[PDB]
A paper describes a structure:
pmcCytochrome c oxidase (CcO), a terminal enzyme of the respiratory chain, catalyzes oxygen (O2) reduction coupled with the proton pump, generating a proton-motive force across the membrane. Mammalian CcO consists of three mitochondrial DNA–coded core subunits (subunits I, II, and III) and at least 10 nuclear DNA–coded peripheral subunits. The electrons from cytochrome c are transferred through CuA in subunit II and heme a in subunit I to the O2 reduction site, which consists of heme a3 and CuB. Cytochrome c oxidase (CcO) catalyzes oxygen (O2) reduction at the heme a3–CuB site in the transmembrane region of the enzyme. It has been proposed that the hydrophobic channel that connects the transmembrane surface of subunit III through subunit I to the heme a3–CuB site is the O2 transfer pathway.
Author numbering:
A (entry chain Z): 1 to 40
B (entry chain N): 1 to 513
C (entry chain W): 1 to 56
D (entry chain U): 11 to 85
E (entry chain S): 3 to 93
F (entry chain T): 12 to 83
G (entry chain P): 4 to 261
H (entry chain O): 1 to 227
């Protein structure tokens, strides 16, 4: 496949932010429930 | 305009996009349920402290992965996007009915999530066998909400099957015979025929269960002269076709992917591939009682079901060897989609072979209701379906979105997922052979080591899922717009550009005789 | 009865930009609003019922 | 008599009808022997076979229904 | 006993356009498969279009399962990249 | 043709319905109801019905449909 | 476009239909478990409103706007055949339940069919009359079809009126049968198989009769041409399906099962 | 019973389980070979710069691809079905025992001669005697004679259960209103464990089966003591 | 209707950070839901 250069390139730092926010969106809520299973 | 476009759609592409979004969301739910299963099993003892909740989680895991992730993605998503494009059709035959097949699924899912929130849930298994699923052992609304979820899903898929069969038969170019349609289109037509014939039988059976629960019928209640085994026949008469429904569109996508990344104009042995899919579809209706080898049926019945089940390996092997023969002599492009497809061929083969082990009723006595069965279907169904979905998704994402993925990230994603699913499911073969039952919240101490490893594998696949979401974000974030793709002469779905215009084939293709 | 299909053809082919479900006139709008209000209101009521049924 | 022998009438995994038929046969024979004041020892083969094969709860439920007049088999 | 309208009396819209075109032996709505010419440079297949390009699928030989797809542009005749059959667009 | 199917409608089909109507009407008398026996495979009640007192079937006929405890 | 297919206007009815399904199912749940008919009556109302407006729009698109070209009509033919096939398979499940139960009657029944304490209907009385009624309606609908093809308005309307009258007669006879039946849906697997299989059939007779009534009013309003009348064809196919399911019920449940 | 890090079947306690072990060894060799061939061929197709992208004729190779798999399936089915018909063959049992499944325990009935019956419950982890097995012990074991053909009849008084003993090759569903038959023959004395094998609700994981196989003389002494 | 890359979807890709928030809420809500349903059943 061939493509145009990125209109809005995503730098290594921008990727670290997006990856971090993505991982945290999965891990924090599930982590909160699993940590508190005793309280349940 | 936003409500008209996305709630009132009569467009095959927009409806396909709705199905892909729905399915991806369902996949997150299904995955979360799978991790809760493996967390309960990841050390000896109890985690949840409530084995009814464990049983509800197992039940919901299966319904979400089958009815809300695989079928919506393969048939509603790839089917709606690709089938009209691959035959040069301007839309589906019934573009407004198509939209109702989609909009039935959110209500269906809401009924499933209502089942789990009222009373103590439906802790039945996805088989929903009476009397456990009856009004004594599962009093209250949960099982009825599960039945209604399945009615709505069933109507969605029956109307979808009518739409796909009509589209594929009626809306090709007048010169194009059935034997000039791409293999993916064949795979959807065959899948749709299986849905049309199988789902009504499930609908009959679960309706009988509804009436036994609420109208004092006794179809499945021996006190009234009924028989729990009748439910099992009606369920599995649907359920075996259902497992071929889950894989057939996957076989179609694999044929396209292997052909494309081998640099070929065509798959090896086209008419053999059509023959094999039709043979699998037909044989799929005459084998169901291999789900019932321990219920007490007659020896000659067991002999027949063993023998009929083994026959399916012949057309299946023609497809596997044909994929290998499509690679043969290729200018191989090691794209991430090709990696998904090669993973599919191998992992599907492993799971199909453990299916042949299980087909032997004698050995099935010892393997039935063990982790051997769980291992079999997580190879052939879970890995097979998911690997075909991820291959199709990374191959066609640029068509659907107009944007390219980062190929290096997509290869990393593949590598993580390959390790995770094999670490999760391979040890379940040992657990099965050594006698660990399925549908257990805890296990005798001897089974600890392979359960521990399996649960560690489940977290590796979670890391892959999270990375997949980041990879999709990065593609939409960077906005690398597609210009050209190779092999458009034998991949018509690409020839209107990326993404294609809302209306395609307003002027149909010219094909002469 | 008399054949008035030509008069309906003219009505439903009028170049007024209306979608077919509203092209009959003001009565179509009323019936659509009744249908959608019962569907959306009913759905909100079903969610309330879910909330009630989710607890003892 | 050790246990119920193989019966070519009931050669398969489902033995429900074998239990039912011997229960009926015992009670039909018992009624026939009692009605002429004859000898129930003649019914002994059926008694041993149904006692061997039939779940206690099935026997107890069938006995209760015979006493109630709600037993649905013909004796 | 009469009183049922005929298609000639009552068909409308696209149904009527298709009905009237068929009476004239015309196929504006692409219901029929066009018959190939010899496909030489002197006798190209003539591909009607309402615009300046149209997708052609070429079934190069009878009973081929593989169709070869390409855009045919207004201007000089183009050739099927598999069999070299000539096609000419006729706006 | 239409003439042939009308001929079948009036000459065979509707006469058949008239004869079956006469047959039914000649056998329409009320049958003597059988002694009540509280058989456990009949008058099933695993959950109350969602109407009336929970114990009457939807098209309950007092003359011929006994309750679990007998005729009303 | 230079193809003959129908690009449908964006429509709200798919969404209202899907929500009507949620309201009917959540409604049945709330009737069976929470002693309330409210959601169920909203769902039934929205379902009827959705089917009315959706099929009204199909009439507008075809009779009034001309979108049903031969290619579109061909697609609808396939769609209706496939829909009937799905309905055949739904009934097959109920026949399988009937044959499973009746061929291997369990000890709870008395190990016989019909079960101890079941007094079946005489299949030579109202069931035979119902058989003559639906067979006769298959003849009258064929007369209606030929009358329409031959351009005969009066005889099409008379034949279709007779067909509908026979469907209504069947429905009133079956209602009467249900009320007079000395067995109920709660009379074990005999009552279960009888009422669920004949009850889904009776529902399909009411649906089919309703479809014929729509065709009757469209015919009164001159919608059909002598050549173009797919709604009538589909209603006839569906009506023949209802007849054939009855003949299988009659032979299986009423006659062989008595 | 299973032991830690176990890969394969529990050691065979019955002649039919022995047969199943030999049959699994045969079948697994085929599974390994076919799995390995497919992986090898993938690697072969992917490891050459040589190309052939023109249309290939499929007819000749499809004969090999259908005949060879058909032969393999026959070679699996023949021994498979021999064992199936062995496990059905008329045996003269010397003893009949019934088991009834319940939520969540088994009951056993020995009614050939005396009305002996008892219930069999899992020993809770908090009550295990030192060295006893978590989730596997019961209070009342199924005492049976070794080296004798036994008829087991299996049913349920509530939901579906399934009566299993892996080392004897046994799994028979427990269905209310149905009496399912299986044959049991142990070559050895000892304790043989199994677990409920049809989901039956919240305590499915916790209603095990324990057979206690003893010489006939000890079985008779046990039966006589139970009066 | 709007055509072309980023315009054939029911969500905006005009701003990659707003997009990250929407994708986070979308996939996160699905992944979280079973944990919160388990919590709801345990708290009964
Ligand atoms: C990548 C991601 C990570 C992977 C996940 C990691 C999984 C864990 C690794 C397992 C290692 C097991 C171990 O401790 O091995 C010691 C073990 C020591 O041998 P042993 O104790 O003498 O066992 C001999 C038994 O008598 C042999 O007889 P048995 O009856 O005891 O054993 C039978 C059993 C045990 O079979 C085995 O011996 C292992 C299976 C092979 C693994 C590959 O095999 C099975 O039935 C397993 C089912 C497999 C289904 C089909 C799989 C297709 C394979 C694909 C082929 C590709 C080729 C490359 O060594 C191995 O056999 C290696 C495994
Ligand atoms: C158990 C239940 C089952 C639920 C399952 C849910 C999964 C199914 C998803 C199916 C998709 C539904 C789409 C229908 C329309 C969405 C309506 C809406 O709310 O719009 C806001 C929202 C978009 O926000 P935006 O960026 O501001 O766009 C606005 C327009 O650009 C500018 O237009 P505008 O200004 O005219 O109007 C926009 C404006 C307002 O415009 C309006 O007037 C719209 C009002 C009516 C819309 C009602 C929609 C009903 C949706 C039902 C679910 C199906 O919208 C807003 O900003 C506020 C509305 C926010 C409502 C939240 C809806 C979220 C979706 C459901 C998530 C699940 C939550 C359940 C919780 C579970 C707890 C146990 O639409 C979405 O929901 C889109 C999905 C979210 C982003 C996901 C990105 C993932 C990408 C991965 C790619 C994988 C697939 C590959 C695709 C291939 C490339 C072609
Ligand atoms: C994608 C879904 C899918 C697919 C395609 C299959 C495919 C097969 N399945 Fe499986 N199966 C499931 C999903 C699937 N299955 C699920 C979900 C269950 C569990 C349901 C539940 O209980 O919850 C199940 C359970 C199931 C059972 C019941 C086991 C039990 O509960 O005790 C059996 C019994 O025979 C079976 C057999 C097979 C066979 C023989 C095939 C065949 O179609 C496989 C054919 C493929 C090959 C053989 C490999 C390729 C072939 C070659 C390379 C040629 C040469 C090969 C030979 C000569 C052997 N499967
Ligand atoms: C398609 C079907 C499917 C899929 C994909 C899966 C996926 C997984 N399943 Fe399974 N599972 C079943 C079907 C499936 N499952 C069924 C039918 C049962 C039996 C239920 C019963 O007994 O009644 C079962 C049961 C089952 C058990 C046995 C429970 C028991 O017996 O007690 C276990 C145990 O480990 C398990 C684990 C997993 C894990 C860890 C995953 C996954 O975590 C593996 C990794 C895969 C993913 C993480 C999916 C990724 C896909 C997406 C996120 C979609 C992306 C979308 C786009 C790109 C558009 N599942
Ligand atoms: C006259 C000819 C036809 C009449 C039609 C019936 C009238 C009422 C209901 C209509 C819907 C019918 C469909 C079939 C469903 C089940 C039962 C219907 C059969 C019937 O009417 O049976 C009656 C019982 O109804 C009962 O329980 C009550 C029934 C009412 C509640 C039914 C709710 C269940 C709905 C199930 C939904 C399933 C939908 C499937 C969708 C599948 C899509 C994939 C029989 O009366 P009885 O007093 O027991 O015996 C007579 C004694 N004198
Ligand atoms: C008191 C009542 C309680 C019961 C309520 C339940 C519902 C009852 C509904 C009955 C069905 C009515 C269907 C009416 C369809 C009208 C639209 C129609 O018939 O549309 C026709 C197309 O057919 C088409 O779409 C064909 C459309 C096919 C419709 C198929 C309908 C059968 C549906 C069954 C419903 C599901 C049942 C399943 C339950 C288990 C229009 O084309 P023509 O006729 O060629 O006209 C064009 C000419 O005029 C040109 O010259
Ligand atoms: C417990 C209760 C749960 C049940 C919930 C019920 C589920 C959903 C609510 C149903 C709402 C129905 C509303 C009407 C649907 C009409 C569909 C229809 O009639 O669809 C037609 C196509 O299907 C055709 O013909 C042939 C197909 C016609 C099918 C009609 C509808 C069937 C709905 C139920 C079917 C279940 C099947 C039973 C077998 C298991 C028209 O296709 P369109 O794309 O519209 O237009 C195309 C244009 O060219 C026409 O001018
Ligand atoms: C199956 C998918 C799950 C995979 C595992 C997820 C990995 C863990 C992610 C982190 O999750 C968090 O962990 C914190 C602990 O590290 C918790 O803080 C908890 O504990 C803290 C330290 O004890 C306190 O300060 C906080 O108040 C308290 O909520 C917090 O709630 C939770 O969100
Ligand atoms: C246009 C959009 C649609 C909007 C939705 C309309 C919502 C209407 C709310 C009324 O709610 C009702 O309240 C009744 C009284 O509180 C309940 O009666 C029922 O519940 C009673 C509880 O006291 C019981 O006595 C009986 O079962 C019964 O009368 C009934 O369940 C419930 O529906
Ligand atoms: C513009 C939109 C307006 C929407 C208005 C909604 C219409 C219904 C609202 C009232 O709800 C009802 O309330 C009754 C109690 O007051 C319920 O009695 C129910 O409970 C009875 C028990 O006495 C049972 O006989 C029956 O299930 C039933 O009548 C009835 O079921 C339920 O529907
Ligand atoms: C299973 C793994 C791979 C199997 C590959 C089998 C492919 C067989 C190729 C047959 O194609 C032929 O090759 C020949 C040139 O060598 C040609 O001369 C011939 O015209 C062509 O048809
Ligand atoms: C006089 C009128 C003409 C209709 C017309 O051409 O507009 C006739 C033609 C056929 C008639 C119908 C048919 O004769 C069949 C029915 C006969 C019944 O006696 C009255 C209602 C009945 C349904 C009739 C109503 C009405 O009188 C119709 C519609
Ligand atoms: Cu008893 Cu599982
Ligand atoms: Na645990
Ligand atoms: Zn060519």
């Amino acid at each position: 496949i061939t493509a145009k250069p990125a209109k809005t390139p995503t730098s290594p730092k921008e990727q670290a932010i997006g990856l971090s926010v993505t991982f945290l969106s999965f891990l924090l809520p599930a982590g909160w429930v699993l940590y508190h299973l005793d309280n349940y | 305009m936003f409500i008209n476009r996305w709630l009132f759609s009569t467009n095959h592409k927009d409806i396909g996009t709705l199905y892909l979004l729905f399915g991806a969301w369902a996949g997150m739910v299904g995955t979360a349920l799978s991790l809760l299963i493996r967390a309960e099993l990841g050390q000896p003892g109890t985690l949840l402290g409530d084995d009814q909740i464990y049983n509800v989680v197992v039940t919901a895991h299966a319904f979400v992965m089958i009815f809300f992730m695989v079928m919506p993605i393969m048939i509603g998503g790839f089917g709606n996007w690709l089938v009209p494009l691959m035959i040069g059709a301007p839309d589906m035959a019934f573009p407004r009915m198509n939209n109702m097949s989609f909009w039935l699924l959110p209500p269906s899912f809401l009924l499933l999530l209502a089942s789990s929130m009222v009373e103590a849930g439906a802790g039945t298994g996805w088989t929903v066998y009476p009397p456990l699923a009856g009004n004594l052992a599962h009093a209250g609304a949960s099982v009825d909400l599960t039945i209604f979820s399945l009615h709505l899903a069933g109507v969605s898929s029956i109307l979808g099957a009518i739409n796909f069969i009509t589209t594929i038969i009626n809306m090709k170019p007048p010169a194009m015979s059935q034997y000039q349609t791409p293999l993916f289109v064949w795979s959807v037509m065959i899948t749709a025929v299986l849905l049309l014939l199988s789902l009504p039988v499930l609908a009959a059976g679960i309706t009988m269960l509804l009436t036994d629960r609420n109208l004092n019928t006794t179809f499945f209640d021996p006190a009234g002269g009924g028989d729990p085994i009748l439910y099992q026949h009606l369920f599995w008469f649907f359920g075996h076709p259902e497992v071929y429904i889950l894989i057939l569109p996957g076989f179609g996508m694999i044929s396209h992917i292997v052909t494309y990344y081998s640099g070929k104009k065509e798959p090896f042995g086209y008419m053999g591939m059509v023959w094999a899919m039709m043979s699998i579809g037909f044989l799929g209706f005459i084998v169901w009682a291999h789900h019932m080898f321990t219920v007490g049926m007659d020896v000659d019945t067991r002999a027949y079901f063993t023998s009929a089940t083994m026959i399916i390996a012949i057309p299946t092997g023609v497809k596997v060897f044909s994929w290998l023969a499509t690679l043969h002599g290729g200018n191989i492009k090691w794209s991430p989609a090709m990696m998904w497809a090669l993973g599919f061929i191998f992992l599907f083969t492993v799971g199909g072979l453990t299916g042949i082990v299980l087909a032997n009723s004698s050995l099935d006595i010892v393997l039935h209701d063990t982790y051997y069965v769980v291992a079999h279907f997580h190879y052939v169904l879970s890995m097979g379906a998911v690997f075909a979905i991820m291959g199709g998704f990374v191959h066609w994402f640029p068509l659907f979105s107009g944007y390219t993925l980062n190929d290096t990230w997509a290869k990393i994603h593949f590598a993580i997922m390959f390790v995770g699913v094999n670490m999760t499911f391979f040890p379940q073969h040992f657990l099965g052979l050594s006698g660990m039952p399925r549908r257990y919240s805890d296990y005798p101490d001897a089974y600890t080591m392979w359960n521990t490893i399996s649960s560690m594998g489940s977290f590796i696949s979670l890391t892959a899922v999270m990375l997949m979401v980041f990879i999709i974000w990065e593609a939409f974030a960077s906005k690398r717009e597609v210009l050209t793709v190779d092999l458009t002469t034998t991949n018509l779905e690409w020839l209107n550009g990326c993404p294609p215009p809302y209306h395609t084939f307003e002027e149909p293709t010219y094909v002469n005789l | 009865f008399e054949n008035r299909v030509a008069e309906k053809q003219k009505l439903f082919q009028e170049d007024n930009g209306l979608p077919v479900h509203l092209k009959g006139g003001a009565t179509d709008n009323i019936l659509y609003r009744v249908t959608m209000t019962l569907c959306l209101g009913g759905t909100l009521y079903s969610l309330y019922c879910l909330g009630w049924a989710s607890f003892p | 008599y050790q246990t119920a022998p193989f019966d070519s009438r009931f050669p398969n995994q489902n033995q429900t009808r074998n239990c039912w038929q011997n229960y009926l046969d015992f009670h039909r024979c018992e009624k026939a022997m009692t009605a002429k004041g004859g000898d129930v020892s003649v019914c002994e083969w059926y008694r041993r076979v149904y006692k061997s094969l039939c779940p206690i709860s099935w026997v107890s439920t069938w006995d209760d229904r015979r006493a109630e007049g709600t037993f649905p088999g013909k004796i | 006993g009469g009183g049922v309208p005929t298609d000639e009396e009552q068909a409308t819209g696209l149904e009527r356009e298709v009905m009237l075109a068929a009476r004239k032996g015309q196929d504006p709505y692409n219901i029929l498969a066009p018959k190939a010419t010899s496909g030489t440079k002197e006798d190209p297949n003539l591909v009607p279009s309402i615009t300046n390009k149209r997708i052609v699928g070429c079934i190069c030989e009878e009973d081929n399962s593989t169709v070869i797809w390409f855009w045919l542009h207004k201007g000089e005749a183009q050739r099927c990249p598999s069999c070299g059959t000539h096609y000419k667009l006729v706006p | 043709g239409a003439r042939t199917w009308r001929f079948l409608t009036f000459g065979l089909a509707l006469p058949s319905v008239a004869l079956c109507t006469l047959n039914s009407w000649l056998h329409s008398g009320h049958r003597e109801r059988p002694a009540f026996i509280p058989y456990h495979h009949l008058r099933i009640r695993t959950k109350p019905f969602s109407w009336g007192d929970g114990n009457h079937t939807f098209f309950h006929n007092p003359r011929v449909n006994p309750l679990p405890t007998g005729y009303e | 476009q230079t193809h003959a297919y129908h690009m449908v206007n964006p429509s709200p009815w798919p969404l209202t239909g899907a929500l009507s399904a949620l309201l009917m199912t959540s409604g049945l749940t709330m009737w069976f478990h929470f002693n309330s008919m409210t959601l169920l009556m909203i769902g039934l109302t929205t379902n009827m409103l959705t089917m009315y407006q959706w099929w009204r729009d199909v009439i507008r698109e075809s009779t009034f706007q001309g979108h049903h070209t031969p290619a579109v009509q061909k697609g609808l033919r396939y769609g209706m055949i496939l829909f009937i096939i799905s309905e055949v398979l739904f009934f097959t499940g109920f026949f399988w339940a009937f044959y499973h139960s009746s061929l291997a009657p369990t000890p709870e029944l008395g190990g016989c069919w019909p079960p101890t304490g079941i007094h079946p209907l005489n299949p030579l009385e109202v069931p035979l009359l119902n058989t003559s009624v639906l067979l006769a309606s298959g003849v009258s609908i064929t007369w209606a079809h030929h009358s329409l093809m031959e351009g005969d308005r009066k005889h099409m309307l008379q034949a279709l009126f007779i067909t509908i009258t026979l469907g209504v007669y069947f429905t009133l006879l079956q209602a009467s049968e249900y009320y007079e039946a000395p067995f109920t849906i709660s009379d074990g697997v005999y009552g279960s198989t009888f009422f669920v299989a004949t009850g889904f059939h009776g529902l399909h007779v009411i649906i089919g009769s309703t479809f014929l009534i729509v065709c009757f009013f469209r015919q009164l309003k001159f919608h059909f041409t002598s050549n173009h009348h797919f709604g009538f064809e589909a209603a006839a196919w569906y009506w023949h399906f209802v007849d054939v399911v009855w003949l299988f019920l009659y032979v299986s449940i009423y006659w062989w099962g008595s | 019973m299973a032991y830690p890090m176990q890969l394969g079947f529990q050691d065979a306690t019955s002649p039919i389980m022995e047969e199943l072990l030999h049959f699994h060894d045969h079948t697994l060799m085929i599974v390994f070979l076919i799995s390995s061939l497919v992986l090898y061929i993938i690697s072969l197709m992917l490891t050459t710069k040589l190309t052939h992208t023109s249309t290939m004729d499929a007819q000749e190779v499809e004969t090999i691809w259908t005949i060879l798999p058909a032969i393999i399936l026959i070679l699996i089915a023949l021994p498979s079905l021999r064992i199936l018909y062995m496990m059905d063959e008329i045996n003269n049992p010397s003893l009949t025992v019934k088991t009834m499944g319940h939520q969540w325990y088994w009951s056993y009935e020995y009614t050939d001669y005396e009305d002996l019956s008892f219930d069999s419950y899992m020993i809770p982890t908090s009550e295990l005697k030192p060295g006893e097995l978590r989730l596997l012990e019961v209070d009342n074991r199924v005492v049976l004679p070794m080296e004798m053909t036994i008829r087991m009849l299996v049913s349920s008084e509530d939901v579906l259960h399934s009566w299993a003993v892996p080392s004897l090759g046994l799994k028979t569903d427990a269905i209310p209103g149905r009496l399912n038959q299986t044959t049991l023959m142990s070559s050895r004395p000892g304790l043989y464990y199994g677990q409920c094998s049809e989901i039956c609700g919240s305590n499915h994981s916790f209603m095990p089966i324990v057979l206690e196989l003893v010489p006939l003389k000890y079985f008779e002494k046990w039966s006589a003591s139970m009066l | 209707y709007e055509e072309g890359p980023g315009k054939n979807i029911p969500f905006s890709v005009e701003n990659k950070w707003r997009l990250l928030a929407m994708m986070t809420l979308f996939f996160g809500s699905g992944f979280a839901a079973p944990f919160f349903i388990v919590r709801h059943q345990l708290l009964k």
